[PDB]
Design a protein around this ligand. Structure first.
Ligand code: BR
Ligand code: BR
Ligand code: BR
Ligand code: BR
Ligand code: BR
Ligand code: BR
Ligand code: BR
Ligand code: BR
Ligand code: BR
Ligand code: BR
Ligand code: BR
Length: 159
């Protein structure tokens, strides 16, 4: 049951990654380290820029994850709120910056994809191939993370 839960969530992360890769037309590295790469808010802010082409979005760049990275995050939060994405799909700064609930970010990304794709404002998220696989090590890492984690995975299935 643990392995499967680990594998499924990795598929959810993979699907959100691919969707963003499609929107931005770029490669975003391994799925196993994708959640952590969003903590600086750059990718998410770049998403705002795409959907707000007439606005000049300010993005803080730095290898070191610091408080000013919050501004990058807030751009994305102001955006999903501005376009009317239901609040139940939103996440808080602490969930991503301090990384207390990264799965909620992935969840937010899926909901946004549907909100936009249903309106033909962006491409639709693509369900993971049935034979998509990850290394046993990557799966175990997620198993370990969920054991020490006291957060409940979001309801992707009800989307
Ligand atoms: Br499995
Ligand atoms: Br799932
Ligand atoms: Br773009
Ligand atoms: Br455009
Ligand atoms: Br801005
Ligand atoms: Br609402
Ligand atoms: Br919606
Ligand atoms: Br598009
Ligand atoms: Br851990
Ligand atoms: Br977690
Ligand atoms: Br699902």
């Amino acid at each position: 049951r643990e392995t499967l839960q680990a594998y499924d969530y990795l598929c959810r992360v993979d699907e959100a990654k691919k969707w963003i890769e499609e929107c931005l037309g770029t490669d975003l590295g391994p799925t196993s380290t994708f959640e952590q790469s969003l903590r600086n808010g750059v990718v998410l802010a770049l998403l705002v820029q795409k959907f707000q082409p007439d606005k000049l979005i300010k993005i803080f760049y730095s290898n070191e994850l610091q408080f000013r990275h919050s501004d990058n995050i807030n751009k994305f939060l102001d955006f999903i709120h501005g376009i009317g994405l239901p609040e139940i799909f939103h996440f808080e700064l602490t969930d991503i910056y301090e990384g207390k609930n990264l799965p909620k970010v992935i969840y937010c990304i899926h909901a946004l994809s549907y909100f936009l794709s249903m309106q033909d404002l962006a491409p639709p998220l693509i369900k993971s191939d049935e034979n998509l696989s990850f290394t046993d090590e990557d799966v175990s890492i997620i198993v370990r993370r969920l054991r020490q984690s006291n957060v409940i995975l979001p309801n992707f299935k009800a989307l």
